[PDB]
UniProtKB/TrEMBL annotation, chains A, B, C:
Keyword Isomerase set for record: yes
Any GO molecular function: isomerase activity
InterPro entries: 4-OT-like_dom (IPR004370), Tautomerase/MIF_sf (IPR014347)
Organism of provenance: Advenella mimigardefordensis (strain DSM 17166 / LMG 22922 / DPN7)
Residue ranges of domain 4-oxalocrotonate tautomerase-like in the record: 1-56, 60-113
Protein name: Putative tautomerase
């Protein structure tokens, strides 16, 4: 499951390092995808370049997760809980402010190694 | 509805400030989501880091909007019109160059407060 | 089909220029969308701001492609192959490390020129 993440700006590397590290380790820990399938990208966002509720500058994370369809409401429900857990622990933010977004892609619609669709595996 | 936005780079803050402000106010004004549900993130893009039609460096906006499924073609159709309106007014761009992308997420597939899926509310 | 792209950081412009140029030319070359419909945005990502497999700093690309639904598994399958081809040729990376993500949007859910949904055309 490749992941892209927006966090409110202003963290040390190891925050935005260890977070990606146990984000990977939690993406394995969240069934399927050994390792080579997962990636995670962090892209910090400036205050006065974001708004939570209606207050510009409000700390935030949104995870968009692209996974290969065929997975269960409850394993997905499990991703969400452990990944909010990790984001909280190692990004030093609130549980409430992480918006994850689980996007299940079909094997013919993900272009992977060699540009052969994921289906062709 | 959390929002992520790519605009061609080169604006003053208040442009890329007031735009987010009435983008929020228009996201309320566009039925459902009181406030705490909405967020908006702006991420400006350099010329020669984007292309509209086939001409590198061409002013542009693309809004990706993540909303909770269950909403109507016409309220969505309403988002699009007022949000192109706002993007135009306060980002100082053309109507034609904003590409919005309405993505309706299911309540079990959005991880929100506490990492409990949105369904569990 | 508007495109957003994350590449591992560290390329010259013309890499991240010509890539967008034949990415456009290949998006035409991949049936439908004359030109004014396509856009492509590149957003480079720092090492220690990304992870492929579980190794922070690993060169990578992910293309998210937003296209208007109604297109065939095999033309999409064609996008993937030529666009991995182009990404490889002109971004100087491996075939295996590009993750594309084909997202087919419905004509009423894409807000385009004038903020009139794409359906209304």
């Amino acid at each position: 499951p490749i992941l892209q993440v927006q966090v409110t700006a202003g963290r040390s590397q190891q925050q935005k390092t260890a977070f990606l590290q146990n984000a990977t380790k939690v993406i394995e820990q969240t069934l399927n995808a050994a390792l080579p399938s997962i990636r995670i990208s962090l892209h910090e966002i400036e205050q006065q370049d974001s708004i939570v509720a209606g207050q510009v500058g409000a700390e935030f994370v949104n995870i968009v997760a692209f996974l290969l369809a065929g997975r269960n409401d409850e394993v997905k429900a499990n991703f969400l809980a452990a990944i909010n857990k990790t984001a909280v622990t190692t990004l030093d933010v609130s549980d409430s402010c992480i918006r994850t977004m689980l996007i299940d892609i079909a094997p013919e619609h993900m272009g992977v190694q060699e540009g052969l669709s994921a289906a062709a595996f």
